[PDB]
Amino acid sequence: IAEPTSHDPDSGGHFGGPSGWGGRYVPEALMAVIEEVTAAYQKERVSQDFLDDLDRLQANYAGRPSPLYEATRLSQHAGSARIFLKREDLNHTGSHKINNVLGQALLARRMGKTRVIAETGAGQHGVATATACALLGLDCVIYMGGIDTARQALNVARMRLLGAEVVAVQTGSKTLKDAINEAFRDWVANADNTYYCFGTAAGPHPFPTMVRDFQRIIGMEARVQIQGQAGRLPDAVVACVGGGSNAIGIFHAFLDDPGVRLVGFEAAGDGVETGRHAATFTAGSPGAFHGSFSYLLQDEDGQTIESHSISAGLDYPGVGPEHAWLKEAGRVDYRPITDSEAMDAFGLLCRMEGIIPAIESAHAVAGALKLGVELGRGAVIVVNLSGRGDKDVETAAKWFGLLG
Amino acid sequence: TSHDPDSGGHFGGPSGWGGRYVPEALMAVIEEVTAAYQKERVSQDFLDDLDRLQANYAGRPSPLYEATRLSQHAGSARIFLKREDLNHTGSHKINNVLGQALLARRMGKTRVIAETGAGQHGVATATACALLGLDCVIYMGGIDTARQALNVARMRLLGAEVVAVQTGSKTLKDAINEAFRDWVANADNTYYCFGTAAGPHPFPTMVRDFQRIIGMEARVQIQGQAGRLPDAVVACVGGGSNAIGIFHAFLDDPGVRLVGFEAAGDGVETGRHAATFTAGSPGAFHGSFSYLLQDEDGQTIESHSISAGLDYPGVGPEHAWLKEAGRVDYRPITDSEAMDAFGLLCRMEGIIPAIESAHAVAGALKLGVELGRGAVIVVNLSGRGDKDVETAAKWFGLL
Amino acid sequence: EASRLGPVFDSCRANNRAALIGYLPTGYPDVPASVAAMTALVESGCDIIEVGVPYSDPGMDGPTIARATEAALRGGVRVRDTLAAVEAISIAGGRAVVMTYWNPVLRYGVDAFARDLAAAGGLGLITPDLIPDEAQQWLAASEEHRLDRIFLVAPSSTPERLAATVEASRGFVYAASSQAAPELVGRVKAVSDIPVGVGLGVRSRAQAAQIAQYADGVIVGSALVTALTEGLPRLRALTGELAAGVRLG
Amino acid sequence: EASRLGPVFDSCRANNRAALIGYLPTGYPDVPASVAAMTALVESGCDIIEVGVPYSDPGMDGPTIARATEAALRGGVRVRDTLAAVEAISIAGGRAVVMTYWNPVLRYGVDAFARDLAAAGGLGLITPDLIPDEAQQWLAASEEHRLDRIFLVAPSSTPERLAATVEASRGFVYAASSQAAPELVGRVKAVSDIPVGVGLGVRSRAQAAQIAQYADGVIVGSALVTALTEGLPRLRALTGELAAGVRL
Numbered sequence A: 001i002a003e004p005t006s007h008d009p010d011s012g013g014h015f016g017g018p019s020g021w022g023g024r025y026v027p028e029a030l031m032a033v034i035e036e037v038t039a040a041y042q043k044e045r046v047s048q049d050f051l052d053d054l055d056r057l058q059a060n061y062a063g064r065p066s067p068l069y070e071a072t073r074l075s076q077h078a079g080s081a082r083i084f085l086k087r088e089d090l091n092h093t094g095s096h097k098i099n100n101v102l103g104q105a106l107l108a109r110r111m112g113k114t115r116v117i118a119e120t121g122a123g124q125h126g127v128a129t130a131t132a133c134a135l136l137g138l139d140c141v142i143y144m145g146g147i148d149t150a151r152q153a154l155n156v157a158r159m160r161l162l163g164a165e166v167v168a169v170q171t172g173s174k175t176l177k178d179a180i181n182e183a184f185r186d187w188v189a190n191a192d193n194t195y196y197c198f199g200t201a202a203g204p205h206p207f208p209t210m211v212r213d214f215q216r217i218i219g220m221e222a223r224v225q226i227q228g229q230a231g232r233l234p235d236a237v238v239a240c241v242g243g244g245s246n247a248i249g250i251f252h253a254f255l256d257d258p259g260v261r262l263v264g265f266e267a268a269g270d271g272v273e274t275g276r277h278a279a280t281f282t283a284g285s286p287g288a289f290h291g292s293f294s295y296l297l298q299d300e301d302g303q304t305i306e307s308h309s310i311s312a313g314l315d316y317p318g319v320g321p322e323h324a325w326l327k328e329a330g331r332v333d334y335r336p337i338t339d340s341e342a343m344d345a346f347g348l349l350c351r352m353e354g355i356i357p358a359i360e361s362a363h364a365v366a367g368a369l370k371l372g373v374e375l376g377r378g379a380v381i382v383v384n385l386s387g388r389g390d391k392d393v394e395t396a397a398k399w400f401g402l403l404g
Numbered sequence B: 001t002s003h004d005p006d007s008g009g010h011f012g013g014p015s016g017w018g019g020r021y022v023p024e025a026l027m028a029v030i031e032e033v034t035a036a037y038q039k040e041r042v043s044q045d046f047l048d049d050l051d052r053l054q055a056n057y058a059g060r061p062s063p064l065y066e067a068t069r070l071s072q073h074a075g076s077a078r079i080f081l082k083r084e085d086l087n088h089t090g091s092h093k094i095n096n097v098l099g100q101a102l103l104a105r106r107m108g109k110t111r112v113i114a115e116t117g118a119g120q121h122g123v124a125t126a127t128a129c130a131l132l133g134l135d136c137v138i139y140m141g142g143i144d145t146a147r148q149a150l151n152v153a154r155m156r157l158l159g160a161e162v163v164a165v166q167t168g169s170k171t172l173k174d175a176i177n178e179a180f181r182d183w184v185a186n187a188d189n190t191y192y193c194f195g196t197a198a199g200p201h202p203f204p205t206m207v208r209d210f211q212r213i214i215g216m217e218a219r220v221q222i223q224g225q226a227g228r229l230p231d232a233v234v235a236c237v238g239g240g241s242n243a244i245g246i247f248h249a250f251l252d253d254p255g256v257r258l259v260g261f262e263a264a265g266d267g268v269e270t271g272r273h274a275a276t277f278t279a280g281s282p283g284a285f286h287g288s289f290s291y292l293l294q295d296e297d298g299q300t301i302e303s304h305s306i307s308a309g310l311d312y313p314g315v316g317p318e319h320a321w322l323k324e325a326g327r328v329d330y331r332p333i334t335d336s337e338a339m340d341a342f343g344l345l346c347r348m349e350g351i352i353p354a355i356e357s358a359h360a361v362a363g364a365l366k367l368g369v370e371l372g373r374g375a376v377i378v379v380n381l382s383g384r385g386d387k388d389v390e391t392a393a394k395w396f397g398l399l
Numbered sequence C: 001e002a003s004r005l006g007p008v009f010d011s012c013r014a015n016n017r018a019a020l021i022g023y024l025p026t027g028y029p030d031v032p033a034s035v036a037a038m039t040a041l042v043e044s045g046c047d048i049i050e051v052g053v054p055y056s057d058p059g060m061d062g063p064t065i066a067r068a069t070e071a072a073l074r075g076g077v078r079v080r081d082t083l084a085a086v087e088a089i090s091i092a093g094g095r096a097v098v099m100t101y102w103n104p105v106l107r108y109g110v111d112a113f114a115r116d117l118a119a120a121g122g123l124g125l126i127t128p129d130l131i132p133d134e135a136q137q138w139l140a141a142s143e144e145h146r147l148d149r150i151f152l153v154a155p156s157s158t159p160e161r162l163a164a165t166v167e168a169s170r171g172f173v174y175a176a177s178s179q180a181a182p183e184l185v186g187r188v189k190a191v192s193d194i195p196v197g198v199g200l201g202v203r204s205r206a207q208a209a210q211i212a213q214y215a216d217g218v219i220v221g222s223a224l225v226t227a228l229t230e231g232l233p234r235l236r237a238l239t240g241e242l243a244a245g246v247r248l249g
Numbered sequence D: 001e002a003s004r005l006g007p008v009f010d011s012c013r014a015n016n017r018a019a020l021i022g023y024l025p026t027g028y029p030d031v032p033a034s035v036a037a038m039t040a041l042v043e044s045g046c047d048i049i050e051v052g053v054p055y056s057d058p059g060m061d062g063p064t065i066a067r068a069t070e071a072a073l074r075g076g077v078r079v080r081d082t083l084a085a086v087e088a089i090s091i092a093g094g095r096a097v098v099m100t101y102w103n104p105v106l107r108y109g110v111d112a113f114a115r116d117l118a119a120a121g122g123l124g125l126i127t128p129d130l131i132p133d134e135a136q137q138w139l140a141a142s143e144e145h146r147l148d149r150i151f152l153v154a155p156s157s158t159p160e161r162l163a164a165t166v167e168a169s170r171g172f173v174y175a176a177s178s179q180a181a182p183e184l185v186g187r188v189k190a191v192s193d194i195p196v197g198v199g200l201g202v203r204s205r206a207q208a209a210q211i212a213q214y215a216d217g218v219i220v221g222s223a224l225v226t227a228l229t230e231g232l233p234r235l236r237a238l239t240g241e242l243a244a245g246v247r248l
């Protein structure tokens, strides 16, 4: 069947009250195309023919279901806890982003759009969008921050080979938040023929809900796989948090399990006290940003504080509204992980298991190691290994002295 | 199976494909690996460990996908892509490596060496040695360390030592030579994890056995998705591991065409190619009797290909047996042809393939025109092309 | 009762002319120079001044205003400097509304900012990223502190949302945008009598007079910033040309 | 009846010495020079001349010989050049065998190469990459054309395979390789009376003397190549010192 509607926002996109998190902080010029997408998604989310077309691509084209590997050789560094890696790194294009892109590309075809635009920080969502647009015959334009086109250059070339046009954003901090600002400008001018394939669980309604619904499959699968392998529900499920898509995707199936801890791990960069980080929940406050009301890093006047992280996928000063609602309600804990902590976990996963994770995912692995020590021997911790680190190989090689 | 060699590793009786053409100094460890394989291949403890890793670690089964947007470019045939590109590390090599890595551990070996050309076998070997706690040394040709530099850094991050081979053609042929010299010296504690369906017995049989899972899966998936066995099954052929793995389940189906496509470089008439069957002749090379590119005196002719994985002048002995029996045909695919299929698969299906695998798709496109509309053609998509993105971007002028 | 900007358009429509609405961002090139320029706008015939609050991520601003808002922010412009600009305009006899993205208002406090804006003599608030769907707090503070609320309508606005946006506005309705502009004004005046201003990237008297045929107000923003970059004498000259254009007889 | 090199080791037995076996690759530094150097070995006291066939992928060869065969192939050496060198050694009174990898023999034809090797005066064939398990063609040719067949043993050779290798050898057995060399020779002496040659990277007269205390023949190759590279007189003097060490 479909999926229940228990944790969804209201018709206006608000979590936990008619004036709470989420909503639509967008100009009126975008409201026509947003309502058109909301109407289209409401119609297709209950269409068995749509869910069939999506499941068919997810199975035969993207390789789902992804396995759940017990990284036994990590147990020593996690207080003798049992780490289970949800291997989203084995998806087509190399991350969880393809789950959401397939749904939204299928939706953009159902709407008759011929042009798809997207933003990207780490390059993984950009590659996934260009992948679906090549698959479904859609024209594709990806917006990327100029600083990210340099530290994730492997993905820039992949997008160009797939037929997409890559535009390097030079305004602002030249990272993810500025790519989103430029993609927003593109949509305002081309709302008529263009679909905006947003790549994370943020933005205005309906995007926080739609992105989450397309990533729900991660948690649905993991919840079944972990019971078959460990014989019980886990003691905790963890994931890294940038915008929040991969976290909310694996978190959702466990929300109604009162014994399952949920911990998201955000990028702390050089340190939360240094002013060079992206720990939105640790050092941020509520505000309206990028189309929703949620947490963001902001000075006393309301200006967005530029974020920094060694991971381009977590270099974002905001977060999705459903995470803000779950943080306020106390259902999910959010903790910082620094650059150095992540890179230790990165190298440990390589040495111990032969998996080269994405530097984003390394934040989650580092958080799981710490969490394992707190829970102790025998605790079952599921980790969402959101992506592989082929994009980060040059960054990781410099970090560990394999270059010069 | 009924297609196995004798105790000495010979395919097909009098022809004598395979065997062991190695120095006596290697016979003690070669017989040691043979006996260990015969013993552990029927051990449920060993089979349970291999299945557990293929499922929860490697990502098996790999899916079978019908590339319907390629149909108009394949004479309206139906191209089905066996998605080995989705495995852990990103190619079929992990299948063979996980079998031999577990076997090295069963034998008490403490050190694993391996050759690599495209870097995929090196990355897979380095991956399993990190997982099992083995010392890893990967021999790679100096030319290949340059044009596949991404996989070199992946290997180093996984904890493996990489040795750049600068002798000979500085490609896959010369990495194998040096790795053989390493084994001669350190056979007491070193397992040679061979990356392709060549070499002395038992390696052609053993590599094929660990890759049979590809064809077995494909034969079940094609019937479920299409209702019948395919009209043809095609793959690219360097040494022959990914081709033999997808072919084997189909050997005894009489109506299934089997076509292997080999690298033709700048063209077979140019002397800058690796088209072993098209231009080679029988001979003994790298431990087996098979086909290889050789001059009038028997010296190995150096091969050239834009693809590092197919840039090899030999080929596995079981393929020589299949070619002699007429069960499989082998055709050349040039650099230009492979790169066209490369870009086509990117623009039509959003799949960036390995340049090795792109040869099979290019051959599949031609075979679709030959068989007509409605014909079902299964293609082994042996690996993804992250290692080749820089090569391909320069080819299409995207820099 | 009537809106704050009601009498202004009443006087303009009685003089067979449109209201000239001028935008300048606070703090460009610096805070004292920008206040000198907003005063110059009042002296040069600007009926309403749009005091802009520079925002770090202004998605609606064009390149000319984007560069100016970044420069003002680098100079250390504050939101409290925008309230000081309004006091300066009120002192010089002008009429000020504030154009701002919503987050600086939330960070300040919606009721607090409305109170302090009206105290400084401000007459209204333009909210380009605040739609009426999310403006419950702003509607209450707007009725309380007697402030106009100018929402935006676009050529793509549905009949439902356009009527709802016009219903929600006080003072005037901003028609942000070829024949798309007069056709949009026609849709607003089909459902309400509220004055309509038109932003159309005006840069000359000819374009200003061309809009004054159908609109109640002509909104000029980018051309004033480009003029201020050249200096205050160029700004007075351009404003004088525009003040002549909004008049018809 | 007996092997071709049988009488050679008997002559070394009566003179209370081991045989000096000298290796040189054909065509290094060129074909005329290599044949000139091989003849010099006979005039300088070499009992047996190993004539090497340069191969493009020599797995069993160290760097001195490997780089010398690479230079010979760059110069264009052919397999027929090796047979021309055997005939030259035989005319000059020497006794020559051919050390080759197996694929050049397959390309020539096992029977045809044996026939042509015997007609040039060759006495046998050393096959480093051919084990008896694959030598059916070679065994038949070795009997037909009365050529000795020299297989290699190794320290790692299992007892069963060592006995099989020795049983399949005619002429002498190449003991390729601490105490590793004499211990391996002892294991061969314990199953057969066939002469055993030892190759151990010999460089000096003292080294050749230590080997002759247990081996029937001493095999020198790399040191001869290194000498020929400096000059033809250096090879003559070094071969002389090696000729003296084998008589102690």
Ligand SMILES: N#C[C@@H]1N[C@@H](CF)[C@H]1c1ccc(-c2c(F)cc(Cl)cc2F)cc1
Pocket: A025, A026, A027, A030, A180, A181, A184, A196, A198, A202, A203, A204, A207, A288, A289, A290, A291, C057, C058, C059, C060, C101, C128, C129
């Ligand atoms: N006004 C205004 C704002 N400048 C930024 C907010 F502060 C700019 C903006 C508005 C909207 C979004 C948005 C998004 F992020 C995702 C999607 Cl799917 C749709 C969107 F509309 C992004 C940036």
Ligand SMILES: N#C[C@@H]1N[C@@H](CF)[C@H]1c1ccc(-c2c(F)cc(Cl)cc2F)cc1
Pocket: B021, B022, B023, B026, B176, B177, B180, B192, B194, B198, B199, B200, B203, B284, B285, B286, B287, D057, D058, D059, D060, D128, D129
């Ligand atoms: N002598 C000799 C030969 N020089 C080449 C052959 F002609 C060199 C050689 C011998 C053996 C091999 C070999 C291999 F490739 C794979 C494995 Cl698993 C085991 C091996 F022993 C490779 C090259």
Ligand SMILES: C=C(NCc1c(COP(=O)(O)O)cnc(C)c1O)C(=O)O
Pocket: A095, A096, A119, A120, A121, A122, A123, A124, A125, A126, A176, A199, A200, A201, A240, A241, A242, A243, A244, A245, A246, A247, A312, A313, A314, A358, A360, A361, A386, A387, A388
């Ligand atoms: C930002 C995008 N990626 C973020 C990312 C993240 C963080 O994204 P979330 O939306 O927080 O799940 C996690 N893991 C991987 C492998 C990623 O690539 C991008 O590439 O556009």
Ligand SMILES: C=C(NCc1c(COP(=O)(O)O)cnc(C)c1O)C(=O)O
Pocket: B091, B092, B093, B115, B116, B117, B118, B119, B120, B121, B122, B172, B195, B196, B197, B236, B237, B238, B239, B240, B241, B242, B243, B308, B309, B310, B354, B356, B357, B382, B383, B384
């Ligand atoms: C040479 C190795 N690769 C060969 C290769 C081949 C050809 O190898 P076979 O053994 O012929 O299957 C095909 N596809 C991919 C993706 C490959 O990487 C290597 O990675 O060392």
Ligand SMILES: [Cs+]
Pocket: A241, A242, A243, A266, A267, A278, A279, A280, A314, A316, A317, A318, A319
């Ligand atoms: Cs964040």
Ligand SMILES: [Cs+]
Pocket: B237, B238, B239, B262, B263, B274, B275, B276, B310, B312, B313, B314, B315
């Ligand atoms: Cs080949």
